[PDB]
Amino acid sequence: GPVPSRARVYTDVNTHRPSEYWDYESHVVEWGNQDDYQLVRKLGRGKYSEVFEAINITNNEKVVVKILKPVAAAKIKREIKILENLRGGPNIITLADIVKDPVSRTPALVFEHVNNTDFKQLYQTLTDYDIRFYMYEILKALDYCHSMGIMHRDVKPHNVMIDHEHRKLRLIDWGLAEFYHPGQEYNVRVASRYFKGPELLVDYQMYDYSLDMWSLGCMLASMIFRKEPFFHGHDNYDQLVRIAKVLGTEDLYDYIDKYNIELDPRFNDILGRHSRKRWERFVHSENQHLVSPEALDFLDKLLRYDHQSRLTAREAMEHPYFYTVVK
Ligand SMILES: Nc1ncnc2c1ncn2[C@@H]1O[C@H](COP(=O)(O)OP(=O)(O)OP(=O)(O)O)[C@@H](O)[C@H]1O
Ligand SMILES: Brc1ccc2[nH]ccc2c1
Ligand SMILES: Brc1ccc2[nH]ccc2c1
Hints:
Blueprint: H1 13-16, H2 19-22, E1 37-45, E2 49-56, E3 61-68, H3 70-73, H4 76-86, E4 95-100, E5 107-112, H5 119-125, H6 128-147, E6 150-151, E7 160-163, E8 168-171, E9 178-179, H7 198-201, H8 210-225, H9 236-247, H10 249-258, H11 293-302, H12 313-317
Antiparallel strand pairs: 1-2, 2-3, 3-5, 4-5, 6-9, 7-8
Helix pairs in contact: 6-8, 8-11
Bound molecules: adenosine-5'-triphosphate and 5-bromanyl-1~{H}-indole (H4N) (2 copies).
């Protein structure tokens, strides 16, 4: 069968913390007062929750309320335990309260409000320096959560809120996050299509923190190359073919051979034979202002098939790409 895998970092974090830390099922939720919050406007609805801009009437401060759908209401102790564990961590969204919504009869998570700058506006105007700056901020959140024995599993642009005026960034939506336990087989049905790591696309279940590093690399490639999304698959199968057209099929076969993984036979008639492309192929006059040899070297070390071969978040922070960032 498949060869086992374990993270190269933070492998022992959940065994050396008390069981109360990771055993989310045993956690007793401390319910707050739903009357403290007045819903103001519906911001959006996803598959797992309805999101509202609200006001905390006990302090007159803006808050964000996530009213969980019943499908999310089952795995809420996991999200709550993760949010409580990571609270106060660098660039981690702050869970302010947990209340019972009187209408939905489900939990509503109350978060600090972030006056986020419009996503299109940030993608279209962030400078080379700003991309480095904000990428370093995201790395602080990922190294923190990984050091805390947690993988986000849904790193993507919409889960990174930026208040550009205050140079403030928060990593949000911890609903898909999990505790990392060496040897555990996880569900591969995580992350958004364009950000799914090759381990998910080849159904390799014994993955770890490094999945977040692939997703981060997909965001960086889209940002510096002005190509949204960078790997533009029609479905989960074409998603792997899109990756193979850039990294090449030879390294993909070396990856699946190393882990004794068998590709779905449906890849026999769609994968083809592709050489690895040099990152310079993606540079053009409209993105050259965002590209540098250090950006390309950094990206090359995130976007690797072998999950054990990608930079870790702490190693990534040491990369020359960040030397210009004021610390
Ligand atoms: N902490 C927060 N502060 C301010 N706005 C927030 C916060 N968390 C979420 N939002 C709001 O959530 C809205 C986005 O809707 P929703 O949260 O359902 O999905 P998303 O983050 O766009 O992506 P996805 O649902 O695919 O993960 C935005 O209007 C954003 O301002
Ligand atoms: Br760099 C960077 C990282 C995450 C982001 N989310 C929205 C804009 C943006 C920029
Ligand atoms: Br980094 C990054 C990559 C792609 C994006 N699309 C919209 C915001 C954004 C940020």
